[PDB]
Amino acid sequence: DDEETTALVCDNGSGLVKAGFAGDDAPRAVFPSIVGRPRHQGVMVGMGQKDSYVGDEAQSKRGILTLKYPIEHGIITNWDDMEKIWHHTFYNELRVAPEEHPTLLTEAPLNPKANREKMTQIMFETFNVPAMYVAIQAVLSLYASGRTTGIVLDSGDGVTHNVPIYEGYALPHAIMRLDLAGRDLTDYLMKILTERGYSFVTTAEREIVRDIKEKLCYVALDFENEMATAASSSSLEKSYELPDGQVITIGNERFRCPETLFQPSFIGMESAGIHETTYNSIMKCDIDIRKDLYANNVLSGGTTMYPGIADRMQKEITALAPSTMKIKIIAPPERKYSVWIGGSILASLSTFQQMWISKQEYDEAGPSIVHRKCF
Amino acid sequence: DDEETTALVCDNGSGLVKAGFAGDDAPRAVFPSIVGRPRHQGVMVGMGQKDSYVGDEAQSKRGILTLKYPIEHGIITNWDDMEKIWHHTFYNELRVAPEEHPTLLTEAPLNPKANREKMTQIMFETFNVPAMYVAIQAVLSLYASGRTTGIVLDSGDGVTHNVPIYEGYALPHAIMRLDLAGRDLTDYLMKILTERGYSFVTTAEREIVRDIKEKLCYVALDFENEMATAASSSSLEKSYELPDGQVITIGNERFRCPETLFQPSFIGMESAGIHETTYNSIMKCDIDIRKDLYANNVLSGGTTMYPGIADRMQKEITALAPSTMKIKIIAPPERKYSVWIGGSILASLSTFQQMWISKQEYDEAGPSIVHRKCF
Amino acid sequence: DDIYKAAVEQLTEEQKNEFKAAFDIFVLGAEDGCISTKELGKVMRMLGQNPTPEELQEMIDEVDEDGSGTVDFDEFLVMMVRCMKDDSKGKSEEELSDLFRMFDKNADGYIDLEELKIMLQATGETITEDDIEELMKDGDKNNDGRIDYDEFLEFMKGVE
Amino acid sequence: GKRQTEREKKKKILAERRKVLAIDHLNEDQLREKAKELWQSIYNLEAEKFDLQEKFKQQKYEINVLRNRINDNQ
Amino acid sequence: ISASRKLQLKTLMLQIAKQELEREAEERRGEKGRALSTRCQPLELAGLSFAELQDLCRQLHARVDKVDEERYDVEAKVTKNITEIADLNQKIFDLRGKFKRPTLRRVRISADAMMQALLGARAKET
Amino acid sequence: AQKDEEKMEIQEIQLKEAKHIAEDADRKYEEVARKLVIIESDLERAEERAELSEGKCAELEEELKTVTNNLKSLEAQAEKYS
Amino acid sequence: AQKDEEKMEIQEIQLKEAKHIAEDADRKYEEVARKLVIIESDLERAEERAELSEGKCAELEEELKTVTNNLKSLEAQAEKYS
Numbered sequence A, B: 001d002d003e004e005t006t007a008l009v010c011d012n013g014s015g016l017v018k019a020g021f022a023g024d025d026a027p028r029a030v031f032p033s034i035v036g037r038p039r040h041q042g043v044m045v046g047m048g049q050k051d052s053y054v055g056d057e058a059q060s061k062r063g064i065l066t067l068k069y070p071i072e073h074g075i076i077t078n079w080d081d082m083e084k085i086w087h088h089t090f091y092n093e094l095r096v097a098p099e100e101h102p103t104l105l106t107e108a109p110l111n112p113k114a115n116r117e118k119m120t121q122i123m124f125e126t127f128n129v130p131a132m133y134v135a136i137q138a139v140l141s142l143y144a145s146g147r148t149t150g151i152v153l154d155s156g157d158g159v160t161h162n163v164p165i166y167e168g169y170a171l172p173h174a175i176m177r178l179d180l181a182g183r184d185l186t187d188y189l190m191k192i193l194t195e196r197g198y199s200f201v202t203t204a205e206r207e208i209v210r211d212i213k214e215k216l217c218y219v220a221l222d223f224e225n226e227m228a229t230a231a232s233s234s235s236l237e238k239s240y241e242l243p244d245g246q247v248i249t250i251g252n253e254r255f256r257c258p259e260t261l262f263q264p265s266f267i268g269m270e271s272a273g274i275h276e277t278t279y280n281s282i283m284k285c286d287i288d289i290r291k292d293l294y295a296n297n298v299l300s301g302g303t304t305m306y307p308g309i310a311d312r313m314q315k316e317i318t319a320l321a322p323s324t325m326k327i328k329i330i331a332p333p334e335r336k337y338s339v340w341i342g343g344s345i346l347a348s349l350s351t352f353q354q355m356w357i358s359k360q361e362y363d364e365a366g367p368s369i370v371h372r373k374c375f
Numbered sequence C: 001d002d003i004y005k006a007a008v009e010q011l012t013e014e015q016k017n018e019f020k021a022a023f024d025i026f027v028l029g030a031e032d033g034c035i036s037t038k039e040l041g042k043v044m045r046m047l048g049q050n051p052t053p054e055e056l057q058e059m060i061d062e063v064d065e066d067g068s069g070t071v072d073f074d075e076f077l078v079m080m081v082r083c084m085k086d087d088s089k090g091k092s093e094e095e096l097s098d099l100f101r102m103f104d105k106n107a108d109g110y111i112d113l114e115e116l117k118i119m120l121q122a123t124g125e126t127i128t129e130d131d132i133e134e135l136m137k138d139g140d141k142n143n144d145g146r147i148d149y150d151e152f153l154e155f156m157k158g159v160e
Numbered sequence D: 001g002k003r004q005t006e007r008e009k010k011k012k013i014l015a016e017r018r019k020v021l022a023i024d025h026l027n028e029d030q031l032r033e034k035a036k037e038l039w040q041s042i043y044n045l046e047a048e049k050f051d052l053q054e055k056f057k058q059q060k061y062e063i064n065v066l067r068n069r070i071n072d073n074q
Numbered sequence E: 001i002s003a004s005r006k007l008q009l010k011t012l013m014l015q016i017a018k019q020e021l022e023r024e025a026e027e028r029r030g031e032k033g034r035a036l037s038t039r040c041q042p043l044e045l046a047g048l049s050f051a052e053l054q055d056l057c058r059q060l061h062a063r064v065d066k067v068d069e070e071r072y073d074v075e076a077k078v079t080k081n082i083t084e085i086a087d088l089n090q091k092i093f094d095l096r097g098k099f100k101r102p103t104l105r106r107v108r109i110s111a112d113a114m115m116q117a118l119l120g121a122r123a124k125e126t
Numbered sequence F, G: 001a002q003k004d005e006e007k008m009e010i011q012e013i014q015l016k017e018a019k020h021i022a023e024d025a026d027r028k029y030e031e032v033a034r035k036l037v038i039i040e041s042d043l044e045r046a047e048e049r050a051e052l053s054e055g056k057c058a059e060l061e062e063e064l065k066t067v068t069n070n071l072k073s074l075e076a077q078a079e080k081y082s
């Protein structure tokens, strides 16, 4: 590289911040988005103890911290912590001053306006970027698949949203946003582990339960048969070693944790599972583009990485859909970073180069410029 | 040396007072902390007989004195005698007036407040030091090892306490203080020696029993096998010459005296041994720092100098702990003075130079300043 | 030990003979002329200090240049001058870092032989190539070929 | 408060450096003495700006050294 | 190769350090000279249009405000970089610091005392 | 004086016995320490090789799990195909 | 005779100190030997664990390759039936 100017494709997310320069294949730095102040007193003098460890540093000292995510469900609830996370991302994980780089944030659909306006105001006043643009997290995941149609189910860690798109024309009346995501699955797993004796309570042990969920849980193809099998044999019980020994054995908690996605009544949510909100999102579309959406169903986001979900979802939709249509579920192996790869592709386009919100435009219309033509 | 001002690192302890200027390797003057008034009448006139011999002088005239320690279990029970001991330490063993030197006392954890407040009031009113600071006896022993984590078992002569520390953040809810220490082992040895015919009763003969304990006793690797071996062969019987002749032969009293540490039921104490209070102190800590505490178990204090204790303790903890964790027991050869070496290191730090309790601060808030920010 | 070795070297033959008379005063009864833990321990017991042989062996290892485990007359002389200490505090770390950066005119984060020989030319004194190679090897234990911040810090560790 | 923090730094520095400046009433001597005070302020600003640029160069050097030691830490 | 040569090498390194310090001082002197030479210009205000002088003073005050704004921006950036450098140095110190704390050894009395202890009662002249 | 000379003689006997036993014990202790160093080095090497084998086994199990899940899915797919 | 007695007392003092040194050396020797035996047992256990892990890894590799071949065959059959 050299002259010229590259764009910063940041992607706030909720659970893992993924960032990197535009035009690559994978994000340069991926690290949890947690800011944890120490909670004990501290007796050693001169140890160089900081007041807040952010990012991946607080996943190593988590034994004496109180980690707290600054993004609850897509929306940002603690602006100071989010500013700290952004500052860390720019200066220590990428080491590029923001004064010389455009930024491309990402935002979930149907989010509060004030969140987006505050985001752009921060990026323009504190970090003082040249130009920033905010994009919907599902259109990027559709970019990365190399398609131009299809209905994308982007089940992140904060919020699961399902944006249908045809021929490049998004259908704003058919977006079905559901707030069940990876975090609720972690909490439900932590709640059902107590049925064997293992109690995880501290906010640090939520990370251990998350690791258990990632490494062991899988989505059952048929729920009742698995419940019957796990209750008779013992071929499912997989063991796992805690960060201090005392291995634990997970029985039928393995496929009961991610089953909450298809039956949100487990955690008390009323709505229908991710297998039926996709069909409802399709049926709201026009009668002539339903075949294409049926054939190009796209999966993205981290939580759709459970082993065996691309078959359960296809079976469910085939049960719901008319018998003639072909149901195909696109599940690329690079699912987790699909949104960021799409963001890189979009930022690398020449046609897109004039859509950025230039700073002089913000100076003339204020932060409310984001809702205007420069979307 | 020259200009400038050095700090006095005193360490009251209970059984041996260790003192010396900050920045050296070993304490300058180490002497027992006993004050013994004469008890007989005295007929020679003009012999220059004093009314109280303190320190190492009363370990040579102990034949006609009644030695009495001024510190029972960490706490100080006889303030006049303790003041006398401090006066001797400053003026005759170091020969430095306290008006020109900061002092750094040491105190066991979980001690009564009034003891600490009276200590600071004495140091500021009677000896009139410029500034004094009180530190917990275990953090210093952790300084001396050059670590920054680890759980330190400081089995002194008065009280055995077990302070776990991680990354410089002490865990106040996991301190397990047990009042079995070297003095109770001396009394128990003096009590089991009577099973062979040797009766030591006088407070002067307690010193002889202490010498026997120091020179002969050792901790058995396996208790039952040693009890069986000592009851069949005679390869263990080691003899020792009293201060007047009449050698004595110690049989299986050798490893039964220090075994009380691991089975406090011998002296009627209910609690568990030093091998199980360490494991309990670890298990109260968080689940993510238990591996580091397992790997960095530190021994300190005088009573942990028994030949063969660093193996018995490791065997016991390995029996208790999960099989995967590695158990390592740090037993430096300079165990006895570990607390004082750590005190010297702490007093020599530049970052610590503003933590002293300056005299004007005491004048403004009274002796209760010690519990405040200047801990 | 290095400053002590220099001080012993700066002694003339007469001063070395005086220090050898001191040696004979110290080493009374030594079989090999080398003060192992035996003579040093008996002397320490005579002095009023009650040490352990570990400290004496560490004193030897700071001065044992062959690895034989003994303290010959030269190493014994270093033991003798170890009774007094002056090489302390290593000057100032900030000063050394700044002057190391000044040495690193190219600011590579490590010192090259080119800038080293440039500064030697500025000084202009006679240069021992073998000693230069020894210094480079001791600094470049990681075998990078260039003296680093930690490498030169350990070069001056314990030195004045 | 971040936008308020930026506005605050800029606006409060301006307010500290802003004064009620009425050049009309001052005669030649007072006007020239005020110009001298302004030149002293310029000298101070330039000296501290050059200190800042030298500190910036030292900061770049320190960052390079820290990166090198991070590389050496593996 | 000898210990004398090692002392010569140490003295040479000290002399190199002194020369670098002197060169840093002369570089600072050059920086001061260049800064004074290149920055501004003196003003002669004798007997001119005094209202025009007031307007020129106002324009110079505006220029001073601009210079102050740029100076304050660079000052804030320098302070932020200093904070980042302190944080990184703290990280390095916590990573590879630890027991590198030096100490002194004073338990062993001087060589004269050791020699007089070995001599016994003979050591009176020395 | 006769008794004192007898005591001197038995003293010298004890001196010789003690010093010879001490030299033998020192030599044996040095040999034992050398053997301990050897065994400790071998133990540490075995431990690190075991850790490497653990990592390898973990990676293999992950790959096996992935492949088995894909296999079962495609087998069901072929059943539906027929 | 009195001079001989004093020399005898000095010899006895030296004898006692030599006995102390010898006994301390012996105790250190035996303790180091015990630690050596313990380290030997630990190294044996580590050898066992590493060998078990290696056998596990070889078995996992073979089963992985077999299942991979089955997977590829079923993939080809699935494409044919498609």
Ligand SMILES: Nc1ncnc2c1ncn2[C@@H]1O[C@H](COP(=O)(O)OP(=O)(O)O)[C@@H](O)[C@H]1O
Binding pocket: A012, A013, A014, A015, A016, A017, A155, A156, A157, A158, A182, A183, A186, A210, A213, A214, A215, A301, A302, A303, A305, A306, A336
């Ligand atoms: N391999 C995996 N298997 C199962 N769940 C995973 C896996 N990787 C990540 N997850 C879940 O997905 C979440 C990360 O989702 P991510 O896509 O990073 O969210 P975001 O959209 O905020 O970036 C984690 O919290 C975790 O619960």
Ligand SMILES: Nc1ncnc2c1ncn2[C@@H]1O[C@H](COP(=O)(O)OP(=O)(O)O)[C@@H](O)[C@H]1O
Binding pocket: B012, B013, B014, B015, B016, B017, B155, B156, B157, B158, B182, B183, B186, B210, B213, B214, B215, B301, B302, B303, B305, B306, B336
């Ligand atoms: N070499 C030794 N072997 C066995 N026990 C010892 C030894 N040295 C000291 N002790 C015991 O330790 C006590 C001294 O402990 P110390 O650490 O001085 O206590 P404090 O913490 O009050 O300073 C003595 O009373 C003695 O019983």
Ligand SMILES: [Mg+2]
Binding pocket: A013, A014, A137, A154, A156, A157, A301, A302, A339
């Ligand atoms: Mg996402």
Ligand SMILES: [Mg+2]
Binding pocket: B013, B014, B137, B154, B156, B157, B301, B302, B339
């Ligand atoms: Mg103590």
